[PDB]
Every structure is written in C-alpha cells, then in structure tokens.
Design goal:
Layout lengths: L1 E5 L3 E3 L7 E7 L5 E6 L10 E7 L3 E4 L12 E4 L3 E8 L2 E9 L4 E7 L5 E6 L15 E6 L3 E4 L3 E4 L4 H4 L1
Protein name: Outer capsid protein VP8*
Subcellular location: Virion
PDB class: viral protein
Length: 165
C-alpha cells in the first residue's frame, strides 16, 4: 500500500497510471525542505511550489523565493507544520500552513488531467476535522514531467490515511 523509503531526488509523474499520488514523509526533527516543483531559479511567468516541514516555534523561509520582496516567503509557525510556498496565475506568491501532528505525513497529488494537477493538502490531526479529507485545501497547477525531492520519502497510490493516522 505504502512503498519506500526512497532516496531519489527526482520523481517521474508522467508514466503514473492512477488518479491519485501521495508523497509521504516521516516527521523530521528540524525545519527542512521536502519537495519542489518548478524551474531551477525563480521565474515569474512560470508557476511553481515549494514544500517545507516547519518545526514548532521556528521561521520557515523559502529558498526558491529567497530573492523576492513579497512577505509570504517567510512564515513563523507555532505548531509542527507543513508549509507550501507557491505561485500560479495572478498570484505572485502565497503560502499555506498546515498542522503536522502525525508521525508520518505528506501531500496528495491529484492527477486530474494530462495537462494539469491539483496539490491537495489537509490539516493532519485527529481533532481538527470530524471527517478527514485530503482535498480540504487544493490548488490547480500545470502538469510537468518530474518533481524534486530533498529528503527520504514514501509513496502510495491508495489512500494511506488508515496507516498514517
């Protein structure tokens, strides 16, 4: 059901023949970059997103958006969190903080079409929602060949909620 651990820095999302793909991570002890989808350096025209783990009472700052005057490159986090920096369409830069109470956790990548994907994130607690839903938060991005991973990770093509929680 859940496969891994993997030590690659490049996932291939082209040949994947399924609706959904989870990219899971064991809760790190310190703030660290998890994955990233976009060009090498910041390009304003192209859409992108960069995911971090944020340790409780730290300041998560983006590397990809390091040289921007926008203020959403840096975020302070109270709880242990996932922090997704992203830009798409008219949005020059934005972030989305989400709780990470579980030991294992990650983000859902919905393969909606051959041209587009949806990055689905949910507040990983046993107390937040009455009904857990991976597509609590969502945003639509263009679909690309590959994605960069920067830590050890696990993959799943089936809903791992049962095992993770």
């Amino acid at each position: 059901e859940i496969t891994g651990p993997y030590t690659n820095t490049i996932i291939k999302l082209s040949d994947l023949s399924g609706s959904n793909v989870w990219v899971l991570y064991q809760k790190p002890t310190s703030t660290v970059k998890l994955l990233k989808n976009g060009p090498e350096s910041y390009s304003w025209n192209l859409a992108a997103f960069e995911l971090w783990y944020g340790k409780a009472n730290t300041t998560v700052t983006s590397d990809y958006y390091s040289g921007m005057t926008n203020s959403e490159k840096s975020v302070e986090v109270d709880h242990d969190s996932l922090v997704l920096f992203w830009n798409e369409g008219s949005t020059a830069l934005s972030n989305k903080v989400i709780n990470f109470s579980w030991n294992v956790g990650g983000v859902l990548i919905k393969l909606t079409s051959n041209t587009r994907i949806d990055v689905c994130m949910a507040d990983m607690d046993n107390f937040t929602s009455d009904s857990f839903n991976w597509e609590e938060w969502t945003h639509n991005f263009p679909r690309s060949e590959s994605m960069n991973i920067y830590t050890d990770y696990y993959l799943a093509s089936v809903d791992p909620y049962s095992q993770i929680r």
